[PDB]
Amino acid sequence: PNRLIVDEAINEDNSVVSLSQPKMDELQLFRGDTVLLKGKKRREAVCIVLSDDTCSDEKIRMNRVVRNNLRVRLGDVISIQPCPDVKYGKRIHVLPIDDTVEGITGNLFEVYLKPYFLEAYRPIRKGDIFLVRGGMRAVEFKVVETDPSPYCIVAPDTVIHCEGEPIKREDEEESLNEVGYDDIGGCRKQLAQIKEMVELPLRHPALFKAIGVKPPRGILLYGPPGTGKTLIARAVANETGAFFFLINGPEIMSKLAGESESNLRKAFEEAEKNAPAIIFIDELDAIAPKREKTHGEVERRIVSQLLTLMDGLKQRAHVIVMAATNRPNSIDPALRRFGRFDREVDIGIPDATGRLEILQIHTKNMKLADDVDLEQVANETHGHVGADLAALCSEAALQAIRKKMDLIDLEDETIDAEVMNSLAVTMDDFRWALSQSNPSALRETVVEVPQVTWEDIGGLEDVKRELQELVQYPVEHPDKFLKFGMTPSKGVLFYGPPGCGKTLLAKAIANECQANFISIKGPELLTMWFGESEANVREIFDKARQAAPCVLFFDELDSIAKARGGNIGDGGGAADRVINQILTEMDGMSTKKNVFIIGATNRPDIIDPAILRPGRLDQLIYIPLPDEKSRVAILKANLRKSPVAKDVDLEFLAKMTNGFSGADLTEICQRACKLAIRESIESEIVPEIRRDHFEEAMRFARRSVSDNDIRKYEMFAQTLQ
Amino acid sequence: NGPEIMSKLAGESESNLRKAFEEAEKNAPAIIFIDELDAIAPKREKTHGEVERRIVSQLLTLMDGLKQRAHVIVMAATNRPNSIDPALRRFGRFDREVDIGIPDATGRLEILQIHTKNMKLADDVDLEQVANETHGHVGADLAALCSEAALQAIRKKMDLIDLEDETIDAEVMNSLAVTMDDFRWALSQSNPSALRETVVEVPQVTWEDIGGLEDVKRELQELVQYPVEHPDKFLKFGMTPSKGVLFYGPPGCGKTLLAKAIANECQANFISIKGPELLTMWFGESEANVREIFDKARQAAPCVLFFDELDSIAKARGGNIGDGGGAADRVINQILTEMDGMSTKKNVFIIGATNRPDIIDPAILRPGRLDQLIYIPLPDEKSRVAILKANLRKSPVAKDVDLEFLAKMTNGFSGADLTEICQRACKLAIRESIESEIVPEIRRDHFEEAMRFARRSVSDNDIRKYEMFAQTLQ
Amino acid sequence: TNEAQMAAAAALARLEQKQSTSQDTIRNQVRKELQAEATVS
Ligand SMILES: Nc1ncnc2c1ncn2[C@@H]1O[C@H](COP(=O)(O)OP(=O)(O)O)[C@@H](O)[C@H]1O
Ligand SMILES: Nc1ncnc2c1ncn2[C@@H]1O[C@H](COP(=O)(O)OP(=O)(O)O)[C@@H](O)[C@H]1O
Ligand SMILES: Nc1ncnc2c1ncn2[C@@H]1O[C@H](COP(=O)(O)OP(=O)(O)O)[C@@H](O)[C@H]1O
Fold first, then answer.
1. Which CATH class is domain B380-458?
2. Between residues 226 and 285 of chain A, which touch chain B (CB distance below 8 Å)?
3. Locations of Low complexity compositional bias (chain C)?
4. Which of A56, A239, B3, B273 is the most exposed place for a label (fewest CB within 10 A)?
5. Which among A160, A69, A149, A172 has a CA at the least distance from the CA of A114?
6. Are strands A59-61 and A34-38 parallel, antiparallel or unpaired?
7. CATH architecture for residues A1-86
8. What is the distance in A from the centroid of ligand 1 to the CA of A227?
9. What H or E segment, with its residue span, contains residue B423?
């Protein structure tokens, strides 16, 4: 009884844990009460319990600081008990740990400990280790003396002493600046999926010895460089405690014949001796490239050696092998057969939210000025990966250090704590670093859950509802579909003029469903055909299966028909190699994988009719240019983020822009916004957009769809009845 | 296994392979199993190195040495029987072979039951639902599925009770049941390894699923059953049984269901070849795959090999225009060849389907090939009603629904179009039922509304061409 | 008890202050004006 599973916390605070209410009622404690935690080897901690809507009933959520003091790891279980007799302390003695007091001098108490405890009212226990962040350094301290014992709350009126040399870290505790899960920003879903696969085999090996189940013995990670593939592999080993062995392709390949095989075997033999252990092989495609793609005997031999060592993992107890590559299909397929590397996780590229999280992670210690806006940076850093965002944080820190501190300090390794704490990084330093950095992954496609909602789309009220019926109803009301023998559609095709919101329709339903949006463009379908790489069709559909829930959007479906001539071409049909592979993958995809396929085209008259057969994109939705009420709605939607003067007549503008698409109405709003901003900036050398700004914008905006194109689209839609 | 031998240096791989045979003799009777055979003895054209050629020759001589190594049998496993050195299949050696393939729905259910023998299942667990849903899975995937379903249940309860020790109390496992939500969850997490493989099985299509065409059903029984039910009567009367039939007529009239239904009644393995597959072979100039398809049919005998959309290639070449040539192409020529060499007593029946007989090489209709012709017109008045009744056999239908009235209106509709009407009415009933909670049956209003959106797929210009062709055939 | 509730109030204030649009248009317009003045001189 009163035993809870240790897991990660959302609240980063050094004295806070979170429980689900049913456990707070059974433990007879209230929100804000102090409790004691009992871990391993007679180690205890004191904390405050809060609650949220994310902790499960069986779990207790805590940060690394609490787990380190209890000598427990994620997946363990501890005891919890209330202690309502906790009172305030009188005098405490806190000293830093030498592991973090390097390159720094000055009054660490006044810089770190005093801000940390002042109005903080934190519960402490003798021997507690806690981390205080600031001045671009993270310093951890130990409680070595308390007048009350073993625990007390430190009030602002207590005496805090700090006299003596920094304390050497003990072997029973780990440094709080070591890499853990809280250092990983984006790809949180992937990290959770991996944790489930590896944490239990390593944390509780007894259960797999006794229970008739096979553990994963190999996980392949893939994505561009700098996304965190090697960060995850190390963070997992650090969190679980397994010995981490590092291997990389090019180093093993740099060895002579016989040396490369011996070195690879040694790593596996050492992992068994040090089990539980994790073997991470970086650049897997370099150590084990496809055999059919090389000529060398040594390269074919090292693949055979790795294949046998992977099979030997059925005998090497508690050893998991992980690997990283840039492309999941650039390695010899034998490694991915049952057993061996039977699991894989797509890391990809962080999205806008993950990029902000990474910037926040790499600023934990940084003092930021009020003008610093990392969300704006995350939105501007398109194509950047964690390696690039970390560079931006460090470069911005250096610029602030050179502007101020380099005119104060000597060219030495030791700086006063007060000087470091006095240094804050401004937005100009982040903008400078942004101009110096260059995205390492700008060409690769990025898949993310879109931020487009239904309120972002003007008009098309019936289409928005129709997509909800097509995408949500099959899983929200499955008993009605079964009752009436209905087969849910697997997708819908959109056709009509460009610039009417087709991209928002697919994103908006993905947003409400919290699903990833995968955007495939014509140039990708054209590359597959011309480059004789039709196998990339499977990569696209597999990305959807692995990214599920997701919406798989195939834009420019006409690109294949156009490649065959489009308007003229030969005497045959639109059938070709790429579309046949696409249709095959569609037929083999189940709706129970939470993947919905949406297509679009601006030339529906040349789409291979096969795509419209039952089981494919059988439903057709026409998206014409917005009507009178929709054009006004579009203008109003774009202006929701800015004050609009009372002299602006949006209905008059919409009546004039009769042939304009939604994309063209957006340009008018954005241009009028820019014009209002231009005036605002000059007034400081205004609070709202004036009629003059919209009328001026009207002089430059033009319709993107000609009158002849409108008739072509309307006649086609009419032909379909 | 391949990698174990290939990882060894020149001289070590040959010695180790020889020792394996020596040990089998010393311990005879013995069985040697060579996994990933194609890794040790790949087709000769796939390797040119001196070391790789020598180790292959060593295997060939050791296989021949089995004449002296009494009571030793060597088995080997490969992914494809044609990816290995053909010399291995010479009389003796590896002359015998067995196609393991993949399990069907029945086999998958048996596999799930086997890998759950030790598992405690909740009352809601239904492994038949799983076996039917696990399309494209192999036994190794179903075993992984069972493990993942158990692991989810284990994490929920085993960690909750905090059973942290070296041994598990038997009572804890005794009360730990895996629910249907744990299997369905695992199904969402798993991913079949054989999703793109060819699936060959006895179809579940019955004659009760096909409306109308009573005379075609009887004709297929004569063409497929009689040659093997009464082989002595065919000899007595000097009758040569047909080896196949070509179906023609408007699309969407059941051509595929007819081939499946007779395969089901006869419990024969049904092989489905579709237009995209015929086009893939044509586009890639890989018509040799046709011989592999017919070879699979022979291995699967008794079987029914159905070639749908035979006109897909002729249409891809232009169909009505194209070039000035004939209906012959790389793929159909190999199909014609394999039928000509097919043995009457191999219990292989070939069925084709086209929508444009005027562009199919007439040679396909010669004796020994698809010599029989069956016309499948648009369903008549009584058949369209039967089709609607069959399509609605899985849903509640209100008594006010007049299926004869609907069939009378849908005079130009195919069976495929009647299904669209049924599904539209079902969707409307679903939307109405869901709204009532924010109904128990499909109402006439739902079918009447569907009638305003459904259209006939085959126009009168095509029906007249179909009828005139059928008339030309007398 | 009461000392624990004061500790909880302090922890809640720290977490909520740290964890808890026309401004991005204003920032982008000021940045564009500063770049235009830097190019005219
Ligand atoms: N997903 C991520 N989240 C947080 N930080 C990341 C992420 N990906 C990379 N980084 C950071 O970028 C750097 C990557 O360097 P390294 O660990 O050598 O990885 P790589 O394999 O890309 O070379 C580290 O400073 C790491 O903290
Ligand atoms: N109906 C609409 N409501 C609001 N904005 C729209 C609408 N249609 C288009 N837009 C704007 O036009 C831009 C282009 O839309 P998109 O669908 O990508 O056009 P395309 O046909 O080029 O893909 C979008 O960023 C969106 O802001
Ligand atoms: N006679 C029939 N009875 C019942 N359903 C039919 C009939 N004819 C066609 N259908 C419906 O039409 C659909 C298409 O049939 P199929 O034979 O696969 O067409 P094709 O062979 O031209 O591709 C089937 O799913 C079936 O439900």
1. mainly alpha
2. 261
3. 4-13
4. A56
5. A160
6. unpaired
7. Beta Barrel (2.40)
8. 6
9. helix B415-435
